[PDB]
Amino acid sequence: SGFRKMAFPSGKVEGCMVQVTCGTTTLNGLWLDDVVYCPRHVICTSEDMLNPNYEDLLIRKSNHNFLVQAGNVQLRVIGHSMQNCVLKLKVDTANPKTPKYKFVRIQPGQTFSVLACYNGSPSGVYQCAMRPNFTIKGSFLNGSCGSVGFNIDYDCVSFCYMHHMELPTGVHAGTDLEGNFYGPFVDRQTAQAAGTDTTITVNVLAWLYAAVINGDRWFLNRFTTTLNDFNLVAMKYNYEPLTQDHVDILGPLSAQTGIAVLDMCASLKELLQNGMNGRTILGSALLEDEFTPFDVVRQCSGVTF
Amino acid sequence: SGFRKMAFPSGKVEGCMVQVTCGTTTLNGLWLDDVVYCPRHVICTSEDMLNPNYEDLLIRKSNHNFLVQAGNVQLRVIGHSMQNCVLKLKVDTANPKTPKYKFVRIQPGQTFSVLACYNGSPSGVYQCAMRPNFTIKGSFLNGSCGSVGFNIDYDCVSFCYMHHMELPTGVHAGTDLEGNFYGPFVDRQTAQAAGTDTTITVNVLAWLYAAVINGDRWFLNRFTTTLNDFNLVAMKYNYEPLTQDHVDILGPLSAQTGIAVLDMCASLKELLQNGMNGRTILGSALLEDEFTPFDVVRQCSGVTF
Numbered sequence A, B: 001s002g003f004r005k006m007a008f009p010s011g012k013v014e015g016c017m018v019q020v021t022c023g024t025t026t027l028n029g030l031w032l033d034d035v036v037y038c039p040r041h042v043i044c045t046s047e048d049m050l051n052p053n054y055e056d057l058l059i060r061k062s063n064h065n066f067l068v069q070a071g072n073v074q075l076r077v078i079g080h081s082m083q084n085c086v087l088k089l090k091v092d093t094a095n096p097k098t099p100k101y102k103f104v105r106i107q108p109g110q111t112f113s114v115l116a117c118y119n120g121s122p123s124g125v126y127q128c129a130m131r132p133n134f135t136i137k138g139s140f141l142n143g144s145c146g147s148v149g150f151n152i153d154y155d156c157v158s159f160c161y162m163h164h165m166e167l168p169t170g171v172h173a174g175t176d177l178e179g180n181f182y183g184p185f186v187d188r189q190t191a192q193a194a195g196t197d198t199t200i201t202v203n204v205l206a207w208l209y210a211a212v213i214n215g216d217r218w219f220l221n222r223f224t225t226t227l228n229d230f231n232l233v234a235m236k237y238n239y240e241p242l243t244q245d246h247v248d249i250l251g252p253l254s255a256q257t258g259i260a261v262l263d264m265c266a267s268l269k270e271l272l273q274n275g276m277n278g279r280t281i282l283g284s285a286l287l288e289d290e291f292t293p294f295d296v297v298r299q300c301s302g303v304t305f
């Protein structure tokens, strides 16, 4: 027992990280088969940052301008292409450490692990959620661009995120591995509205189920509710609306605990209306929304990769 | 910016994990050079668990009774020895994936990353602290025994923890890699007192400095205190006493922020006496004590491995 904010083991991704340098700018790249993926803003200078003309900037570059280094080994760049906001550098060597992988565009409210890297070397790994407003609340310093987010299923790494930007508000924005930003964001040094965020209701409920499984019992009450009644409360507290699709994915946790989903909703309603009264759940004094129902079952059942 | 409960990249440790089977019991082992380390209770049955005579149980075992499997490869066991509560199985092959490593016995209040494994395969990685009472609050299911905790400095893995036991209270106990338990615990299925735990004061202060660095500003006040006055408050709230050695290791964070350590202590005093008033610090509604001052500087400066 016990419940932790657990990340995927990062070894398969560590072997794909490289350093990419174009002129003055060094960031991280992802080396998969014979292609290196990295943020296109590696080709900018500080003159460029307020609104770079990336097409014009890239036309001034040749294959030999992109320095790609994997540890101490230099890779030979034999082609380059810009796809949306990512650069794809073809190299003459396939990465011998390439895992089985896919590129996935995740949905808001899903979770993934981030391997934070600097100069192509790993610094740390942590778990986070894609917020409903398509930002992430990460831990990124200058030089972390090109660090990736991922999930692992069996032996397959699903890459879902590449880091590009810290907004002036201190939250983080990035792309899928085809270079399409999550959210309304563009790769320019500008104030950019992220828009209203909400709490991920289905994840809070999953975590309350995790709490019951691990022995935090105290928030269970004698009440139930309806999906309408609950969603009126969710709206007042800036929680995402709960749908039958969410009730369905909570099915396994409801069956394991014997607590019907709408009974758990009534416990969450009371917590929203009355607070925690100074008490804690799974070591937290707030309602946690960075565990999906899949995450809770995985951690409570010991799935390996 | 941003601050996350970050683990070390786990790849160097993933390549050392194996499965060890003795009779009916399967758990994890750590394969370093030509030795596999694992908890000695792999040799028990459920008859044995209330008070195993490990010397007698091991005398009934031979090298060929220990099945050690690294992925799909079987290792040949050519010797076995019991050191305190760990078994050391000499194998005829050195692990080609052995990193530079050392064995370290950590102090209470220090942090490390845990690679949770089942059947020799990694499941997840998370960061945690050794509690002042020498337990850890982990996430471990049956079959996780032999999972290890570690730190990484440059290219060297310092192994500090091997998982052995979940106490009836739901907290976790284990050994250093010489098999010596942290704390008063023994490897028997019995109720075992852990004794009073406390909050790790120097870590809370480090995290308050992390908060300031990242823009949580609101708990700073117009007050200061003394080490005596503060420690009277620490005692009342079951916080560890603060020493000049702790003030010294907080020096770098004090210099970066310009906030004297005793001024930060006065902010913490007010938080202990008055609570958070429904507000949050770095996404938490309680005072966080699982970041050391070294952790905060590392994450705020982007150290890689």
Ligand SMILES: CC1CCN(C(=O)Cn2nnc3ccccc32)CC1
Binding pocket: A041, A049, A140, A141, A142, A143, A144, A145, A164, A165, A166, A167, A187, A188, A189, A190, B001
């Ligand atoms: C086009 C241009 C937009 C602005 N920008 C970034 O924000 C890069 N970045 N990303 N994460 C960061 C964390 C700390 C500091 C800088 C960070 C550079 C690229």
Ligand SMILES: CC1CCN(C(=O)Cn2nnc3ccccc32)CC1
Binding pocket: A001, B041, B049, B140, B141, B142, B143, B144, B145, B164, B165, B166, B167, B187, B188, B189, B190
């Ligand atoms: C000597 C004997 C003591 C009791 N014991 C354990 O507690 C093993 N263990 N460790 N972590 C666990 C998490 C869930 C269930 C069991 C777990 C087995 C060995």
